[PDB]
Design an enzyme around this catalytic site. Sequence first.
Site, PDB file in Angstrom:
ATOM      1  N   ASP A   1       0.822  -1.204   0.000  1.00 57.52           N
ATOM      2  CA  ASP A   1       0.000   0.000   0.000  1.00 57.52           C
ATOM      3  C   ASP A   1       0.868   1.270   0.000  1.00 57.52           C
ATOM      4  OD1 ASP A   1      -2.239   1.895   0.862  1.00 57.52           O
ATOM      5  OD2 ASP A   1      -3.258  -0.045   1.081  1.00 57.52           O
TER       6      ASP A   1
ATOM      7  N   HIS B   1      -3.576   5.993   3.805  1.00 55.67           N
ATOM      8  CA  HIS B   1      -4.277   4.829   3.271  1.00 55.67           C
ATOM      9  C   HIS B   1      -3.726   3.484   3.762  1.00 55.67           C
ATOM     10  CE1 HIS B   1      -5.791   2.101   0.035  1.00 55.67           C
ATOM     11  NE2 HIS B   1      -6.818   2.932   0.026  1.00 55.67           N
TER      12      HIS B   1
ATOM     13  N   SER C   1     -11.078  -0.717  -1.005  1.00 53.84           N
ATOM     14  CA  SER C   1      -9.787  -0.844  -0.330  1.00 53.84           C
ATOM     15  C   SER C   1     -10.014  -1.079   1.161  1.00 53.84           C
ATOM     16  CB  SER C   1      -8.930   0.408  -0.531  1.00 53.84           C
ATOM     17  OG  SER C   1      -9.569   1.561  -0.028  1.00 53.84           O
TER      18      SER C   1
END
Length: 596
Positions: free
Chosen positions: A30, A94, A415
């Site tokens: 990620d 994220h 996600s």
Amino acid sequence: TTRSWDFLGFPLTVPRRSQVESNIVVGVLDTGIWPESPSFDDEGFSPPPPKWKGTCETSNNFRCNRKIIGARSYHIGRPISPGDVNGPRDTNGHGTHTASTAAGGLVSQANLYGLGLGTARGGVPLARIAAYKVCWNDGCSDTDILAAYDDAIADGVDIISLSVGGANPRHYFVDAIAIGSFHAVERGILTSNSAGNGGPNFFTTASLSPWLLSVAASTMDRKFVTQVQIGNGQSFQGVSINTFDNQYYPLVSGRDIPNTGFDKSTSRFCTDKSVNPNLLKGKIVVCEASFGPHEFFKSLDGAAGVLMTSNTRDYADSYPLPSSVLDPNDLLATLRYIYSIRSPGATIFKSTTILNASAPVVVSFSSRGPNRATKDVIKPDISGPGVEILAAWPSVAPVGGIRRNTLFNIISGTSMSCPHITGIATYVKTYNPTWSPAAIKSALMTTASPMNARFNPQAEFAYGSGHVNPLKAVRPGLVYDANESDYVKFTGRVWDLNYPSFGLSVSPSQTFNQYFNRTLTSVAPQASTYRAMISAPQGLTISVNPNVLSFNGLGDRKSFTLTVRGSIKGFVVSASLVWSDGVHYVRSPITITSLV
Ligand SMILES: *[C@@H]1O[C@H](CO)[C@@H](O[C@@H]2O[C@H](CO)[C@@H](O[C@@H]3O[C@H](CO[C@H]4O[C@H](CO)[C@@H](O)[C@H](O)[C@@H]4O)[C@@H](O)[C@H](O)[C@@H]3O)[C@H](O)[C@H]2NC(C)=O)[C@H](O[C@@H]2O[C@@H](C)[C@@H](O)[C@@H](O)[C@@H]2O)[C@H]1NC(C)=O
Ligand SMILES: *[C@@H]1O[C@H](CO)[C@@H](O[C@@H]2O[C@H](CO)[C@@H](O)[C@H](O)[C@H]2NC(C)=O)[C@H](O[C@@H]2O[C@@H](C)[C@@H](O)[C@@H](O)[C@@H]2O)[C@H]1NC(C)=O
Ligand SMILES: [Cl-]
Ligand SMILES: [Cl-]
């Protein structure tokens, strides 16, 4: 995660194989990771597993511990962009969010300005985490994804969480994600991959490899809302993640404050600087459109609040100013109010929650199949909570466009559902450490809870086998196993690939007759006999042979053939096959489509 796991029937007190879980390593490809997060504390942890061969980069003040045992970064072929910082540290947020959703430790009092208050955590709190930073401000390149896979597989990760994907479908062996995951699979490593956020139209997902576990995003019972009370007392239920405290402000319509060179025709939308900055200072502006944090800064500087509108409000976002997205009718009521008195006003309340009895439902943006590469292999494979998930966030990364005093953030996307599935697949692995990627995936799919096709007519092309059910997946009874060879085997028809679901592409109004061969492997030590139960719509003739199968024990294998005949008028027709011995239920959906 303060509610999602509970919603899935996975409470804080679920049984665990602690010693096994404490030695499992979850690889996360990620935006990197923020080590200072409470979710990654390592108090009480033993040293890294002897099998671990990964290393830890130190650039950008990074330090691994007994929880985050690996940290790498890749940025091949081009200079970094504004905002990027060389090193494995997460400056975006994220990666910290997804990693904590999959394996974050329990963190009590987790909240975003009080919102979602509770105990946050991942599926496997005791698992180790190895972060591989492959995503930057210019995206996640094919070169870096492959670099991460080459190391992760060799480093010793047991499973990979990949909340990234391409925008367009590519052939498996000219696609970095397909290539990396394939080699991971030959080493017994499963990849959980997000389906994409390009929905709701058919053919929008790019997660097509049969060996990948592709995940859609669905809603949970908790739903964030933002009440708005105009001056006359009327109260509207809007949608947004609004952390700002309630406050009464003068109200104004974009229609009545057009900017220079603009008129009501466009100023009503508030976009592209169409509203006069002088007439909205300190006021709540009503906009007949919906937009993100960027637009707030671009056209609404000075405003005290913003009321937007949209026909699609099945998930909430945060904004840099008090705001709420109203349904069109409520927007109209607001305008009638504005022109019913000389000094209108309104109050936007801090977000609260309601219980949506319809959940789980696949959300608007979740990417849909059919599989553009192998149309006969249904995608996505399964669905999980991907709407308004609260998880770890770097104390320095912006939330809704601005920096806030929080260690958590609430966001939506495939996600977010991807790492829930990663956590669950890992939990399953702790109880079944010898299972292959295909077996683990099979377990989650055959025990998935059926979803309502009336709330998602696209059916399997929206939610695959259904809503993930953690506790049932641990002991599926039987699995549809497979390995690297099967994916590149020549029999090699396609309808013979031992997949947990059945897909068939035909022409409308025409008759068809196809058959699929499958092999079931028992994963339980106790022997039992299973009987097949078929549910098919009128116009179809579906049968299985044999229709009864007995397994003598652990590892026993039994094959069967499924025959489907008939015709269909619609684009998507759903049926199902369920094998049960009275204790286990092994469900495989059967989808017939006339889509090309
Ligand atoms: C509880 O959750 C459900 C599910 O999220 C909410 O119902 C959904 O509400 C959204 C609006 O935010 C609807 O979106 C419109 O969708 C149509 C197309 O509908 C068709 O296609 C979708 C897939 O794309 C299917 O899911 C549908 O079954 C249908 O075949 C589109 O043309 C519009 O432009 C909007 O995007 C969505 O359809 C709807 N889903 C379902 C299954 O009802 C529900 O929201 C409340 O009820 C809906 C009908 C609206 O009146 C909302 O304003 C309400 O808030 C939510 N309940 C609450 C209280 O929040
Ligand atoms: C469906 O796939 C099965 C994969 O296991 C096939 O059965 C396997 O066939 C092998 C021979 O190549 C044999 O060694 C395996 O033991 C057997 N697997 C088991 C235990 O069932 C199956 O092939 C047919 O059925 C088997 C029992 C044999 O009679 C073969 O000659 C048949 O071709 C496949 N069924 C289809 C589509 O024919
Ligand atoms: Cl370094
Ligand atoms: Cl550079």
